[PDB]
């Protein structure tokens, strides 16, 4: 028996898998390249001093006092945490489906089975009572609206992230804080690079295109009365029946 | 049968999975970056001497004698054991559900089956006797209260951890202890960084927001008498039936 | 029952498996060699300075300001993202089959079961009504056309990628931007190599040959009336029956 | 049909999983940090010589002749083998459950099934004969006592281990034994650190707290006659029935 | 039911698994050594410069401009792509069996079930009609011929590959291309070695011997009229029956 | 049915798992420490020369000519192959149980089922004929004796291994063989360490204690007539019936 | 049913698993030590130059021109390919059992089921006809003979491999070929070691002992007439019946 429509499950699967697939590709590239940041330290620096510079600048991306970037410090904030936000979007998009299957799936399952059993025998009072009620349709529309809002916010974020200048992956960092402040052997600023930024912007473009094409599909899902071929549980039950009526032989015989 | 309510199941699933998911991402970042601490040692130091400095300062965070930090030794202590506390919270939140499914699921399942079978035939004395009793409701409320207290403590900890100044990941360490005390070639103090601190604070913020949103949900779960749409087993049985009444065709027939 | 034709399933499996197999082999080479780019930096450069040059040139293949390549910066752009586009093609070729299985396969399954159960007894009006409809055939042809267009675009891309000159993996890069601009110790240009390009072009040739062989197969699939042995659901139902009639003993009895 | 009480299963699961979970966390931290010991060696030493010093001091932890430590040789010995003892405790606590599930489990299962099948036909002589016997109760109490003794020994060990001074992770070692004795280029003593000591002590504290909480639970399990709501098989069969009586509909009818 | 003969399945399994097994051994050896090429570079070269030389010469095996080899650049091309050709052979040998299973196996299964059931009378026209047809024998012979041709081409390739002189793994390479052309500090030619070549030639000898032994087996499969103990579809049915007739009790009784 | 006794299953499980568990711990430590042998070579040696010294000394533990050890070359030989002997014991202890399961389990199962089916109806002649026979008892005693002998040999070995002096992990090696013999820049002897020896001795002590405790259990299993509550199949059948009689309700009814 | 005798399946499992287990141990040791070959190169050699020497010598074992070994160049060839030959033996020993299960198991199963069903009712003519035939006994003896010959060849190879002198792991190599021939800075010969030779010889000894013990077992299997308790299918069927007769209660009833 089906408790989720084909278009809804397609949308959920795309919106959840795509961010995770892109995260997997980004992680593979990260392990392949070996570093998400690289700083140019002097040749007098030993290997561990250069590694300290790299790690300090990586940790200093989130600190105001030791950075200088032409695009501002917000772009450098986002480059470091890009995969985290993608997984956050994936979880937030997967949750509404989880809540629907936990809460409303069983009640709709029972109602559909009861309707299909009263059908195949001919229940009008049951259908009219559902027409009066607006319980399940409210849950369905609320879940779809949460999904739509999450997708819209993801589109806004990915459009902003892709908007960041390609040279936003460069920044100047200073390690001369604390005891190192008066170290005359350390240069004042180090030129750093965020290596993965180039991958992240193309991944954001891909996800943005997919979500922009997916938004109209989600919008079409709200017009539940129009999909049926007012806003009441009767309308949603009708849609589920038509998507499910293929399993009722009597329906096919009547169609003939 | 549904021996656990949808709200309880979703709350437990979120409260347990989220810390584990954040720990997984933190571990992925830890392996990607490669170091949880980087110390700036002289250029004259060999690579093994610099590695010794790093490992000594990593283990010296818990030692008050050989450190100097403006935020105190306590915040530096927390930075080192952040993921472990997350796993501790995950275990402490998963345990109450485990105890419920071990010590209360069978007895509730048997009672529900008996009530459902005595129904579908029409038991009043059984329901009144349950109204007198207060056994299962006490277990349910105790488990919910344990979960609520654990979540409140997690919120307090994560609000404290996120409150630590971003510059609390820096500290001065000394290795000149023991035979190294008279070594004039070793600097008195080394500048250290806790690299993962920046990401740990964002993870703490995410978990804090999620748990702060979950607290009102858990609080609403306590009012078992008001969730029906006194504090006795009759109320819990009524809630479980209404959540599970969908599995009886006679109920739907009567509703029609 | 079979809701997907043998040739269609073969084509989908080949088209969605070959790019993934090539991606797996490319990943194997990437891990084996350990570097996707190698730059020749002075001997005075420390190890970490040379690593910075390598990673900076890796991140600067997507930036015009820091490149000088005889074949243009577009071919160098493609060399970096070749494995991603293979997975893009794999997903775009797997999606139509999944959408067919989700939104068209069960209805055809029910229709075939009804037809076979009505047969084995002799329904003519049902078949004529299907002849008077173009619902499922439109979905089938749309999915086949989407697959054909995706395969044609993949062929065009792979033919272009394979056309890139073998020496297109070489390019000159400069790290002297920003603070490093006035550094007289850094050479103006570094000679870089894209090592995986040699593997990628042979993989592209293999995929191009396979997809060019598949194009005629996909084209033959469009002529649904010819495979039957007009453009309406009757032809598709007839084809599916003849492919699946083997599971009807009465058909064999009539054959003999 | 539950052949193990809920309290016993909970106790066994906690006592076995917790040491394994702590071992997993310790192993992850050991991999992430990369060194269980770091020794400070002269800068004249090549890297292989410093690695030899580290390995020799790691192997010399168990050799009194070549080490000097103010806390004694025993605490340094324990730091090296902490996870091994944790797994030893885990195995020793899992074994009694294994022995109970192999022997005395099928016998109790058969006896319970016979008693329940004789019930629903209302056996008194059978219950009285079991009252005379003291066979299965002896095995149950022996297993519980073994578990209690193992938990008490684990508590004693963990309380001792946590009691070790934090500075017990430092010790002086000499590699000048054998052909290296007269090597004037090697310093007499090297300062060593055990990096995982600080984490191991927190893990020991966690396990100690959990096991100290479990001890009263285990002690409560011995009073089998008082858990009813003399020491004979009847007193154990009664408890197992009350735990498993939920699967007897006639019992619920009689209760009503 | 056996839809594919024992000899056919044996041949397919050997011809597919053996190349994959050899690929697994080759990959294990490659990871064991870590380098598929090693070039001797001056001691003045830094380690990163020598790594660049190694990678450049690895990528320069496919380029005529920067290579000198007495055996020609063709043998050097093959050494780099030996496992790829093995996997190509494995896929090309697995495909015909896949197509047989997808497009011919079910029809033969249905025919066998029909004829088997009729033979259990306790049908002559069906057998004669099959004798007057070649629909399935043509498919079987086409698949066998494709497999035979693929195996013959694999034998030719492996015999050629093994024929390459053992010294063919050596070649001279020049990195002085582009800005490096006028670098007087770089030697004109670097001697290179393909380390895996020694493994690859023995793996090729093993595979060549196995496929040379399999060729007569495959050739024997074409004489379908002779295996039964003319070229028409009846003969294939006879062979499949004799293979599968062991499941008919009536056949054994008649044999007695 | 239980074709193997609880005591025998426990003994086999312990004897097989314990060596494998200790091997797993040893392997984990080996990978964590990163080296099984450390040798002190001059500082003039480059890193690769010191690595050659380490590997040559590792390979020369089995060669008498190039080593001088205080405890003899035999103890140094054992240190290198300790885990392999543990796995050898594991295999040799798992084999007898496998041979029993493959050569006595089916006949025993059939005999037990026949006896149980003839019982539950009341066969005396069958039991007397079994009394007049020693077929299965010989197999059982032979398997138990093989297990006992293997355990005794393992105890002897582990007691010998644990008896090796702690300083047996040190030895002197010379690489000056062949062309290196006349090299005056190489020290005549190098000081080596077998690092894992200290852990291997504790693992041997653990296994020795476990097997010493297990020997009396195995010896008790030989007295098959005494466990029954002469050396012929009757006693063995009686033992397996008494262990298995719990699955016979008629037995319990008669016992009452 | 049991289509494979216990002794035969024991022999196959041992002969196939033991080489695989030894190969697994060898691979674990190879990864732990990290090198299969180590050459002593001058201290003036860079790291990459010494690595080139090691790789060239590894690839030069299969080349007569550039080596000098007093034990012959054949033994050095074998040391490099020991695990490959072990896997070859494993495959060649697993193949006969697989072919038997492919081309003998179904017919034998059908014949055994027919014989058992005709029995349990009393077929004499069937057994007498089998008395003359030799179809299946020939297959059985051929498979056993192939297994015996493979085991004998494995014993010969392992006895030869173990006979190689322990010092056969040392050899001199020259890298001065081609361009390097006139390099006066490279020594004429490098002393090399094959580190895994010492372990490989013990593994060969273990496998040799096991296979030498297995040869008499395999020889005993040929005498099919004597295993009964002439050379025709009647004897083989009788043996399989006596091994399989335990699954026929009528046989036990007659035995009583």
Numbering used by the authors:
A (entry chain F), B (entry chain G), C (entry chain E), D (entry chain A), E (entry chain D), F (entry chain B), ...: 28 to 149, 195 to 301, 323 to 349
From the article:
In this work, we present a case study using a streamlined version of the DirectMX protocol working directly from crude cell pellets to purify the ATP release channel pannexin1 (PANX1), and investigate its structural and ligand-binding properties. PANX1 is a potential therapeutic target and associated with various pathologies, including inflammation, pain, ischemia, and epilepsy. Several PANX1 structures have previously been solved and all of them approximately show similar overall structures albeit with differences in the intracellular domains15–22 and lipid-like densities at the membrane interface.
The cryo-EM structure of mouse PANX1 was solved (3.1 Å), representing the first published structure of a membrane protein extracted by Salipro nanoparticles directly from cells. Cryo-EM micrographs revealed that frozen-hydrated complexes were monodisperse with 2D class averages displaying secondary and tertiary structures, as well as heptameric organization of mPANX1. In contrast, much of the intracellular regions were not well resolved in the cryo-EM map prohibiting complete atomic modelling. The dimensions of the Salipro-mPANX1 heptamer are 90 by 104 Å, which is slightly smaller than those of hPANX1, which are 96 by 109 Å. On the protomer level, the mouse and human PANX1 structures are highly similar, with a root-mean-square deviation (RMSD) of 1.556 across 256 aligned atom pairs. Furthermore, the structured intracellular region of Salipro-mPANX1 exhibits some minor but clear differences compared to the hPANX1 with several alpha-helices shifted; for example, helices encompassing residues 342–349 (Salipro-mPANX1) and 342–355 (hPANX1) reach a maximum displacement of ~ 5 Å. In addition, it was not possible to resolve any lipid-like density in the Salipro-mPANX1 structure. Since our structure contains endogenous lipids from mPANX1-expressing cells, this lack of lipid-like density could suggest that endogenous lipids have a certain flexibility surrounding mPANX1.
